[PDB]
Amino acid sequence: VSVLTMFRYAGWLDRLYMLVGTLAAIIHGVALPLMMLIFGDMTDSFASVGNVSKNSTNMSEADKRAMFAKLEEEMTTYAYYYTGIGAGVLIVAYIQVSFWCLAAGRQIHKIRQKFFHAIMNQEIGWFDVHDVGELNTRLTDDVSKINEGIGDKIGMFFQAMATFFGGFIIGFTRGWKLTLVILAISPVLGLSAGIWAKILSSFTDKELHAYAKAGAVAEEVLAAIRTVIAFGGQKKELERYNNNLEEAKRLGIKKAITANISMGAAFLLIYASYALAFWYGTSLVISKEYSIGQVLTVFFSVLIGAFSVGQASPNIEAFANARGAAYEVFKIIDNKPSIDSFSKSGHKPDNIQGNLEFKNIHFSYPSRKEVQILKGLNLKVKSGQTVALVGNSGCGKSTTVQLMQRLYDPLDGMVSIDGQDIRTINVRYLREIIGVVSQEPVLFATTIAENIRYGREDVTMDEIEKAVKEANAYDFIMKLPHQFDTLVGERGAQLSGGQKQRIAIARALVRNPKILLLDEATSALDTESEAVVQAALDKAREGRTTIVIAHRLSTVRNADVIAGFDGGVIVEQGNHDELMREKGIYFKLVMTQTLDEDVPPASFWRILKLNSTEWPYFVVGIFCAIINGGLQPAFSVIFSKVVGVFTNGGPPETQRQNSNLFSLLFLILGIISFITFFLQGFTFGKAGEILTKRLRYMVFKSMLRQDVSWFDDPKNTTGALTTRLANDAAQVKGATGSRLAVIFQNIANLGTGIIISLIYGWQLTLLLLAIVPIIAIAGVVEMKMLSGQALKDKKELEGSGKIATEAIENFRTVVSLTREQKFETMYAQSLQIPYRNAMKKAHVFGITFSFTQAMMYFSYAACFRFGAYLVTQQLMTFENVLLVFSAIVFGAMAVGQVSSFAPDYAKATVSASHIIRIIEKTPEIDSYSTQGLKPNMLEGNVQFSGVVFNYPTRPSIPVLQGLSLEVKKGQTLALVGSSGCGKSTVVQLLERFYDPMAGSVFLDGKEIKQLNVQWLRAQLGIVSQEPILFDCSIAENIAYGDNSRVVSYEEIVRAAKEANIHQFIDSLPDKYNTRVGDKGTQLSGGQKQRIAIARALVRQPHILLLDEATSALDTESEKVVQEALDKAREGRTCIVIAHRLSTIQNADLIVVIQNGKVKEHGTHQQLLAQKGIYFSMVSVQA
């Protein structure tokens, strides 16, 4: 209905031209079966000659005279047919592609310009609706679909219907029996495709549920990565992950099995129809003059028409996607929300020293996060006053500044400019009397001259000069090469934040306004710049009424009037003295303040290198593809033999040969093709299956064996890694299938065709290869030309979009209106360049396609041309005329598949790059020894000497600078201080995750780096500051066995008892075997921390590590957990990094750490007796 009605918006010539396009489209479509009627005619005469030459056999010289004269006469008319249709189909070709560019061009240009223009004219609304910059993304995709909707695709659709319905017209008239037979296979072929779609829908959801587990198991483990290494539960998360893989491979293969059978059987019913047509076609020969070979050909083209319906379907999908995308932005495009925004027309008053008078204003933001920021306002400011706003954040100081522009229309009351209504008058004019100095001084990246020039479209370079000088912006322009003509470089790097603000002050001075609205125009600057901007602001004031917003109370001292706010309600009014004397809000504030996915080196067939390593057998698939490839010509030769025994040979046994060939056609084709196709299907099926396992196996097991700048700093999120495993293993699954797919078409065209060529006339071979290789290259060279024009188009539109997106993302473009239409001039000038490229590529796209359809007729041309003459005179044969047409169609399926597997190989290579860099390794925690798991190395005195550290992201302050520590056995090492002191970092280096940039840490003398990995996970008592459960039952969470670990009933009991989680274990029936579910994210914190403790003491370490388990908990929970801790330590090292210094007083050695530097160190009572750092930390904690 409505979807395409809006879509048209077709110009004066366009609406006419839509009809010219339709009009060429029919007659383009029609010409192909008419062209094939001539092919039937050439058959008809050859038969009228052959049946009497063979059935008389009483002359051979009469036949050489009279029979060849009719053939000669017929050939004179043939010459004027193929040339005529060719000359039509050439022109109409160019016309339908001109539809593609020229009509679309003018639509896109209209859309783009309306879009950019409607946006600047609706102000607020664009910002209200969705998020800025996502709009120019979606818009630039939309205008691409426009090319497709006003595209030649529509023309192709009409053309398709003409070959179809129009095919049946000629069919019906030359014989109506066979019409009914073709009309019946259409519902059969449609039923079969219907089972296909069913199989697809069922098997997809199945692969998805299966892979779902493999993604959930892989997701949680790789985020919990530091914890799982540390308890040594790797081999179990590996096995569980392997478990999901065994089930996923069996649904993957059944899918492949079903796909081949559905697809095999599909081709079967096509082959049956192809035979069936002949069999019922023959019945019209032997006993009737009803078919003379006309309908036999004409009905083959009706099948090509039925496939033309299949080509329609994409055309339609392009059109739907084009309308749907369009009508949704049409909504913002056409229809501004308006009547509180606009930008154009209305009355203009005269403002000389406007007042600000606020009358009973309450307002709320759209988001219902902050509702009524403003509520009840009476403020009356006389001209030549300076009003100060002090408050709290939520007073909506920003809100009053928006209402003043008339961006919103206030909920209650009105704000009256010069005591006159602000909702009656033109916005534009209103904007010009009101200067605004922004809280973000972001500007365009254009010349210093252009930035002053945005303030009024009349500033001469003198005034620019005058501007920078009073605005004390006159410094940086001189340092900068080229004075004013210095373009603001990069993304803003030629200017400080301070310098930007200075350009904005200079600009608001150039505008000469009577209201000056200063929003953090003295706040967010350094102590030096502050004075500089203040003096400039002073010089800009005292000739105008102004409102200054500042958080700096030193500048609000000297304001004429201060007005207090505590939430939106105007509380104080008076000047400095009046406020301070009463002790208002103001007096209150005085007192408070006093990619990684683009791998660079490209593969060189590393695909098949790695495939071939994990390859075990299957030489039969490719061999089966070769025979299935030569199997295709057996039909075409058989069809020659059909029409063969009908053209030449008398009436006796014509029928018999056809009956025999019918049966032969069945057994040779339908039956063997299914078998041999399923054999190839079993081969690439199992190939992708075992790749699907082994790859995901070989990545994920290698992942648990890596750490460090991808698990000690991920540069691709967990979900993106899981995505990579998905996509990759699926992609190779299709890749193996593409190998055999190329071999299939290769023997199918080139190979078997050669055999066929040897039985040609030796001239035909020569003539033929002057077509077939040429038309192949010619479609490829079209693809090349297609992408070449596309690539250059994307660059041009990128620049017009870049300058658009920069304006819309800046909310300060809406503040101005003066540079809006200036901006819309530039957008116009930029959009003219694609207009010209659209006209240039109209002839380019136009001439390529015309030349492709010119080679179709030229084939048929050389075919019938040469087929007569020297060949008709002597050595006339029924066959090799139909094989030429097959050869044309063999190049079609070769070029088509070759182009198809171009993106297949691309994505296959990319998948390979990933699998190679995983195989490339980072060889940290691969497994090492320096002991035999000796039990006389237990604890030690662990040394840290001269250790510096800074994260793999370098800008984040180096947290360890000059750190050296010591820890003696049997003693709790507290570590206290404050954040960013490398508290946590110390625990990380003792666990062996990302060891320090410089310096070293030793056990007894052997580095952590060379420490025995296995024994290290039976030497840790780690506790997270976020403990997280696994999908495993609580019993299995609590304890995890391995070949480094044991588990037992008695163990989990003692762990739960000691950890005090046993309270919670009691509740819930099945006790320990009770599963919570939902990744056990349903537990309360107290429960969680205990669960981490129970894990800790299972490992039987002599080192406990505690990560903020009293700053992630509160109350009785902290205490109970400290009790679990107290009974665990029976005289062993513990690390408490916790920031509650009130529960640290038991620690034997407290280290006060500043930025890697031990400041004070010692036992509690010493440090506490000091009035130094430590005591100050305990004082301030409480």
Ligand SMILES: Nc1ncnc2c1ncn2[C@@H]1O[C@H](COP(=O)(O)OP(=O)(O)O)[C@@H](O)[C@H]1O
């Ligand atoms: N237009 C806005 N809508 C929503 N939040 C805003 C907006 N502008 C600023 N903010 C943020 O919300 C905070 C408080 O809201 P606001 O009503 O602007 O209080 P105030 O202007 O008095 O500081 C600001 O400090 C800022 O971080």
Ligand SMILES: Nc1ncnc2c1ncn2[C@@H]1O[C@H](COP(=O)(O)OP(=O)(O)O)[C@@H](O)[C@H]1O
């Ligand atoms: N793997 C990491 N990569 C990047 N930054 C990290 C990583 N780990 C932690 N950080 C960040 O570095 C901060 C400071 O580190 P650290 O001094 O160890 O913290 P704290 O002393 O408060 O426990 C962390 O609080 C966090 O914001």
